[PDB]
Design a protein around this ligand. Structure first.
Ligand code: SF4
Ligand code: SF4
Ligand code: SF4
Lengths: 299, 74, 97, 171, 156, 176, 70
């Protein structure tokens, strides 16, 4: 039954990412004055399916072992990185899972650098080196902010987190920390306004958008949600899914609106605006439970 | 002054200074120490009777020893 | 070993996706035809802040002990030293463009 | 798929170390060392291992090979094999197969030691009432006990930062 | 017979998947590029048909040559043309592109774009209306509908 | 008469500077931008469904390059070569012979739809309105041979619709 | 209008709803209806091993309630 659990996880990742692409394209269309796409079939579903098919039948051409090894790592992260996400009963009860999130984000940085090395000595690989540098400049911020938002939760176990979110949401004790972390999720997804940047393009594209859905599900679990009532977990599943959907639409909706940074403005902004503010909010979150006598039950 | 120059720096040093100084004012750090000391993990060991102590209550129901009552009274 | 089974299934299915991406089209039709310094400062900067993150991050497991004063003291000392390193490169105009 | 799963992952670990200590091109060496770090993480998590092994995996794989491949890609080229590299791989593979031979077909292997090569479930605890870990309160020291050590550690790292900027053109 | 039935339905499926979206790369030198941008307009959507503007050459489905080709432009034109996936189709938009047009009797102007690449759709006009270009793209889709590729592979 | 801009200083009153500081450290006008984009989200799109709903046009659109003929009569053309005399791309090619009846006519009448820039000078230069810019827009031809219209192509083209062209001309013989 | 974007949202939300429902039903379906005993500590694993030992079925969830009192 355990391989059946694995198949019920990683068969809807294909449908999830493909229908995510139609959802984001339709949503951008209605953000503008566009009905795109609706002509190709009933409300545009066979258009992403058959378009994925056409992308698989492109017949491209060509170091070969490196070109093999990069997108296989990207998509095996995209598969193996929905394991401890506690849609009510998670797949593996990891004692620590958030540090596993950080480690596999670093593996995504490996993937980008291997693709840039496989790109065979190009001004594109210099740009991809810069993209590796900007992507690696974010796991400091994400780990430190994640450390502070678990500090009010005691353990790394994330079931304790779903215990903590019953009374009020955790968005209220840490809202600006959450704001900086959500900007870091925009940062880690390598999309707008944080840009730029051959095949197999379907597998690489799949890796990026499964990484997006992972970051949005983890955002939804980390800060808000509903209550885990046993012997009817589907209620929590539905409410969690609705909130994660609204957050992902908001995520693409913020992508729909602003021009993208300058690279040096991005570094300048990152260090000289997030990084002291992270440290200051984090030391305040350290000294907070000793001044409220509320340290969480680290069991 | 510097409030327009680097305002996030000013707010950062402000919350940092209160995070440093602010543990000097608390009626709650003693509560933190009592909570984090009086949580049993290991086994509460027994010991030999004949030290003739006017303490160390022989019954766990017996409140003759030092215990907690401010817990349930918040 | 359950997670090893998951890793094995995901790795094998992803390799089958890559081989569907490559060795599927049977229609074999027609075969046809300097670096900078400021890139390097960012990596070592990340590296040293990551090391001090590794020093910081076992903080919440430690939160249940008696010596609270020394904990708060050395924790504030660690974040203060990290911010001092940041302010040192900030005031010595290091990471600038 | 047997008792010796820790031993097999140790064999693949030695394979990875021989794979980059056979002196390849350095980005292939970084690939092999990523393989080595992953399987060493597997070994320590087999000993459980829940905290520290996957912990420093972030620092080792999550912080070092990225910077090594970064500097390797940007600095020099080796842009498009030699018998010495594959010969070192031959000698490492042969000594590995010789160790497998003398472990599995004999009693003990002694270089200058006494290795009893058998089922290494020994040594292990008889299921005591730990209820946290060993690693939990283990690394949840350094703060109620570690006065001197983390002070000199952070001081050394701050000096490391100022050393790096000086060498790369302080100020 | 049943193998013929299978090859016919499979060929129709893959040709349908090809004619589904067809995102081009917008090459676009002169004012016909402005009219390509105006058939990216809200009042005429490319995105209703799966057609996406995307200057990535390595995922270009078809290619729209629109504008006035010159002698200095043509080598880079075919160098862009050859770094493209092998199922490729060319839409020549514009009087300049499909036969030289107003700058025909002149040096430094290639007489159309037959002299560089094979051309599949000619849509004339100066500029061709977005209306007319979109009629041309629909006729391109029906050209893709009539292709019988895998049937010719089966009776090969 | 001028209006030069960027005349405001950042006001050193505490109200304005704390409003700009709260703007900086609370991310306000970014949310205002999201509000404007949502205001265009919930509108209704101006997308005509193209192959059914064809777009609006004018009575004076310039399309087909058709020819015309007289009411119950032969070709309106005379072959007096004014359209080749004015054709700025020199796309018109006329070779003219009279028939045995005595009236002057043609042999060959070629339009380079490649070279055709679609001015309307041949419409606005023919003295009898023989060649007329058509109403439509669909040429869309696969082969470079087939966009070189001959005289019989134009006759079978202009005889494909008369009442369209005559309706447009009757609507439009006074502004020109 | 955006009445038409709602089927794509709904279908992709069905695709997000399915793995948690499948996981929860498989846990409640292949463990005798009892929830799968989450265990993080060696105390609880020792307790679970003696639980599956004293049941005799070699299944920890059978739970053999209040019968071996005599
Ligand atoms: S055909 Fe006309 S509109 Fe197009 S590029 Fe030439 S001059 Fe411009
Ligand atoms: S179409 Fe008109 S202008 Fe041209 S040759 Fe004929 S009569 Fe003269
Ligand atoms: S519209 Fe202009 S280029 Fe075209 S045939 Fe008439 S005069 Fe010549």
């Amino acid at each position: 039954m355990f391989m059946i659990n694995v198949l019920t996880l990683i068969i809807p990742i294909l449908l999830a990412v493909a229908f995510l692409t139609l959802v984001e394209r339709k949503v951008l269309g209605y953000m503008q004055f566009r009905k795109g796409p609706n002509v190709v079939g009933p409300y545009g579903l066979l258009q992403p399916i058959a378009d994925a098919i056409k992308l698989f039948i492109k017949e491209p051409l060509r170091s070969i072992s490196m070109f093999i090894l990069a997108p296989i790592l990207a998509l095996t992260l995209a598969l193996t990185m929905w394991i401890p996400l506690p849609m009510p009963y998670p797949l593996i009860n990891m004692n620590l899972g958030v540090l596993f999130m950080l480690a596999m984000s670093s593996l995504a940085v490996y993937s980008i650098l291997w693709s840039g090395w496989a790109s065979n000595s190009k001004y594109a690989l210099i740009g991809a080196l810069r993209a590796v540098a900007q992507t690696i400049s974010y796991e400091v911020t994400l780990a430190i902010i994640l450390l502070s938002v678990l500090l009010m939760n005691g353990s790394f176990t994330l079931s304790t987190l779903i215990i903590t979110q019953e009374q009020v949401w955790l968005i209220f004790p840490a809202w600006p920390l959450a704001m900086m972390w959500f900007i870091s999720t925009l940062a880690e997804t390598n999309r707008a306004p944080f840009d730029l940047t051959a095949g197999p393009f379907a597998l690489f594209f799949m890796a990026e958008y499964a990484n997006i859905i992972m970051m949005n599900i983890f955002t939804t679990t980390l800060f808000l949600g509903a209550f885990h009532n046993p012997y009817m977990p589907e209620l929590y599943t539905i409410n969690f899914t609705i909130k994660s959907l609204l957050l992902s639409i908001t995520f693409l909706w913020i992508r729909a609106s602003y021009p993208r940074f300058r690279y040096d403005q991005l570094m300048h902004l990152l260090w000289k605006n997030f990084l002291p503010l992270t440290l200051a909010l984090c030391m305040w979150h350290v000294s907070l439970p000793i001044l409220l006598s509320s340290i969480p039950p680290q069991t | 002054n510097v409030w327009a120059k680097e305002p996030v720096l000013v707010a950062s040093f402000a919350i940092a200074g209160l995070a440093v100084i602010l543990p000097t004012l608390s009626p709650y750090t003693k509560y933190s120490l009592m909570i984090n000391r009086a949580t049993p993990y290991n086994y509460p060991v027994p010991l030999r009777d004949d030290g003739n102590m006017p303490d160390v209550p022989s019954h766990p129901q017996d409140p003759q020893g030092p215990s907690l009552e401010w817990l349930k009274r918040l | 070993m359950n997670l090893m089974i998951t890793l094995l299934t995901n790795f094998t299915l992803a390799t089958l996706l890559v081989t569907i991406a490559f060795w599927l089209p049977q229609l074999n039709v027609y075969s046809e035809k300097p670096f900078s310094m400021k890139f390097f400062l960012v990596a070592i900067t990340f590296l040293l802040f990551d090391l001090e993150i590794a020093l910081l991050l076992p903080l919440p497991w430690a939160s249940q002990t008696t010596n609270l004063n020394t904990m708060l003291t050395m924790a504030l000392l660690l974040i203060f030293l990290l911010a001092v390193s940041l302010a040192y490169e900030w005031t010595q105009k290091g990471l600038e463009w | 798929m047997m008792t010796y799963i820790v031993f097999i992952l140790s064999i693949i670990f030695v394979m990875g170390f021989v794979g980059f200590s056979s002196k390849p091109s350095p980005i292939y060496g970084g690939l092999g060392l990523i393989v080595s770090g992953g399987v060493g993480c597997g070994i320590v998590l087999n000993f459980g291992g829940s905290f520290l092994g996957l912990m420093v995996f972030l620092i080792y794989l999550g912080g070092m090979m990225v910077v090594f491949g970064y500097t390797t890609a940007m600095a020099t080229e080796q842009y498009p094999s030699n018998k010495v590299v594959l010969g070192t791989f031959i000698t490492g593979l042969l000594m590995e197969f010789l160790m497998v031979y003398y472990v599995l077909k004999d009693k003990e292997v002694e270089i200058v030691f006494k290795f009893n090569g058998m089922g290494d479930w020994v040594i292990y605890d008889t299921g005591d009432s730990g209820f946290f870990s060993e690693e939990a309160m283990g690394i949840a020291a350094l703060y109620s006990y570690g006065t001197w050590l983390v002070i000199v550690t952070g001081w050394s790292l701050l000096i490391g930062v100022v050393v790096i900027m000086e060498i790369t053109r302080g100020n | 017979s049943r193998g013929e039935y299978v090859v016919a339905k499979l060929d129709d499926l893959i040709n349908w998947a090809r004619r589904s979206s067809l995102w081009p790369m917008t090459f676009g030198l002169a004012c016909c590029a402005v009219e390509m941008m105006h058939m990216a307009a809200p009042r005429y959507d490319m995105d209703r048909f799966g057609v996406v503007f995307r200057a990535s050459p390595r995922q270009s489905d078809v290619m729209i040559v629109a504008g006035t080709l010159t002698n200095k432009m043509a080598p880079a034109l075919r160098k862009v043309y050859d770094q493209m996936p092998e199922p490729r189709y060319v839409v020549s938009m514009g009087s300049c592109a499909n036969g030289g047009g107003y700058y025909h009797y002149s040096y430094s102007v290639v007489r159309g774009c037959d002299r560089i690449v094979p051309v599949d759709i000619y849509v004339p006009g100066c500029p061709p209306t977005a209306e007319a270009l979109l009629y041309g793209i629909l006729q391109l889709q029906k050209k893709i509908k009539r292709e019988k590729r895998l049937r010719i592979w089966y009776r090969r | 008469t001028y209006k030069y801009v960027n005349l405001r200083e950042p006001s050193m009153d505490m109200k304005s500077v704390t409003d700009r500081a709260a703007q900086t450290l609370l991310w306000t006008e970014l949310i205002r931008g999201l509000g404007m984009t949502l205001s265009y989200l919930f509108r209704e799109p101006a997308t005509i469904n193209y192959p059914f709903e064809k777009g609006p046009l004018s009575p004076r659109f310039r399309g087909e390059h058709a020819l015309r003929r007289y009411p119950s009569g032969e070709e309106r053309c005379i072959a007096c070569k004014l359209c080749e005399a004015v054709c700025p791309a020199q796309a018109i090619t006329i070779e003219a012979e009279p028939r045995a009846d005595g009236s002057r006519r043609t042999t060959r009448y070629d339009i380079d739809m490649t070279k055709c820039i679609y001015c309307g000078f041949c419409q606005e230069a023919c003295p009898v309105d023989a060649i007329v810019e058509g109403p439509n827009f669909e040429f869309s031809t696969e082969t470079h041979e087939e966009l070189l219209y001959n005289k019989e192509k134009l006759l079978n083209n202009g005889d494909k619709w008369e009442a369209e062209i005559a309706a447009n001309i009757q609507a439009d013989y006074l502004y020109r | 209008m955006w009445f038409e974007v709602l089927p794509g949202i709904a279908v992709m939300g069905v695709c997000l709803f399915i793995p948690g429902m499948a996981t929860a039903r498989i846990h409640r379906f292949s463990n005798g209806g009892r929830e799968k005993r989450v265990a993080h500590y060696s105390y609880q694993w020792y307790l679970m091993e003696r639980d599956r030992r004293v049941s005799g079925v070699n299944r920890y969830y059978v739970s053999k309630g209040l019968e071996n009192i005599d």
